[PDB]
Amino acid sequence: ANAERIVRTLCKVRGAALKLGQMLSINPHLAKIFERVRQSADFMPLKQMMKTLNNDLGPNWRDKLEYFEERPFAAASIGQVHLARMKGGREVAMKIQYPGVAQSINSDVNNLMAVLNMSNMLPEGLEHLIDVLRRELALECDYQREAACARKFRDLLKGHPFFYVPEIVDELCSPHVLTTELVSGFPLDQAEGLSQEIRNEICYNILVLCLRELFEFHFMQTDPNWSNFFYDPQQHKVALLDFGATREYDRSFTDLYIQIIRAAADRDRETVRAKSIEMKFLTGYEVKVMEDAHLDAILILGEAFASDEPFDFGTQSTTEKIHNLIPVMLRHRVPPPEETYSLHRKMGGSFLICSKLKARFPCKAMFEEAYSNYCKRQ
Numbered sequence: 001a002n003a004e005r006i007v008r009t010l011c012k013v014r015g016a017a018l019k020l021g022q023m024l025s026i027n028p029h030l031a032k033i034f035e036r037v038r039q040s041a042d043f044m045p046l047k048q049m050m051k052t053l054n055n056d057l058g059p060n061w062r063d064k065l066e067y068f069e070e071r072p073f074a075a076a077s078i079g080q081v082h083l084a085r086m087k088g089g090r091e092v093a094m095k096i097q098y099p100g101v102a103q104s105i106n107s108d109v110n111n112l113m114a115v116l117n118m119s120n121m122l123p124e125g126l127e128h129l130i131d132v133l134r135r136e137l138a139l140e141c142d143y144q145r146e147a148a149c150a151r152k153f154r155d156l157l158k159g160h161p162f163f164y165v166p167e168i169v170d171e172l173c174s175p176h177v178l179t180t181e182l183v184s185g186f187p188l189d190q191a192e193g194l195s196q197e198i199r200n201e202i203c204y205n206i207l208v209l210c211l212r213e214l215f216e217f218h219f220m221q222t223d224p225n226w227s228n229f230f231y232d233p234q235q236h237k238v239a240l241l242d243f244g245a246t247r248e249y250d251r252s253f254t255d256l257y258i259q260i261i262r263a264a265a266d267r268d269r270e271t272v273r274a275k276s277i278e279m280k281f282l283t284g285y286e287v288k289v290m291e292d293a294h295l296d297a298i299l300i301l302g303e304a305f306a307s308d309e310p311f312d313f314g315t316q317s318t319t320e321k322i323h324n325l326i327p328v329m330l331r332h333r334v335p336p337p338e339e340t341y342s343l344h345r346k347m348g349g350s351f352l353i354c355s356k357l358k359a360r361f362p363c364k365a366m367f368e369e370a371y372s373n374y375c376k377r378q
């Protein structure tokens, strides 16, 4: 009862609940509650959707389309995606967010925490949980920024043999509406049933891309979500639609992180500790167990990038260690600077996709290539 009771309340603030779930990576049976909320189809009425459209794309917005699907295909973090076709026959996907979602952030976040605190299920983590939550939700609402990020990433991936970013339809974009070209295929959410051979090459290319986003582009998504990676079986390509929480970082800052991964693969615990303190992962005076919990959680990363043999991300053991790559918050109060939080969250979220898809492939070659390019720039 209390279960379905909580679920029903959290759906009224679905975006905040899910974003909070990402920050803690799914503990009690609250993981079920979050999953149920993730499956909940609490969509905003069409009237509301038509309001944001007419109030952003103009009263004659439907004059631009041959067809507008009234039933949403799926729910976004804050909006929902409706499929449509433009007057010329071009198939597109329109992500429409609701009016005032940005002004409802503080109220929704507080309602979320009130539900969780009252339920006495939260791990009861630190103040810092609200500040980061309101910050990430504000970023997702800025669809104009999201559009710009998508155009930039599309250029970075120009001519790539596996990844591509769908083009943006500026004619149908706005602060509350983001429209892209239709993509063929399905999100990796529904790719568990694919061949072990397909899933290994999908995840191999995702992890290589992860290394480039971190140490070559310096332009990465904070929380990777396999629901936003569409796999096209016909073309054997992956369409990238996960650019809602994108940020840039100084090459010097990401250079400290690659030194940590270097040391991790070299089993140099002291350098991992020293550079970790330099990045403010650690303050240097964390109790022995808190520091060892952070250094231990990193061993899994060094294990993969140091093995010239295939690394199995889907094992029960490795899977559990990959889900614990968020020790950055547990009993851990300047907080871990949001820049540091996002870098380790990009790496860990990438390993997570490899684990959920039960992927297995070598990882040493791709990192030595990434570290080589680093030394060249240096």
Ligand SMILES: COc1cc(Nc2ccnc3cc(C#N)ccc23)cc(OC)c1OC
Pocket: 073, 076, 081, 092, 093, 094, 095, 166, 178, 179, 180, 181, 182, 183, 184, 227, 228, 241, 242, 243
């Ligand atoms: C993750 O976020 C987004 C997801 C989508 N979904 C889609 C995009 C393109 N083709 C699709 C085809 C089908 C089919 N059958 C279903 C969904 C599609 C669109 C977005 O922007 C317009 C997003 O936001 C950036």
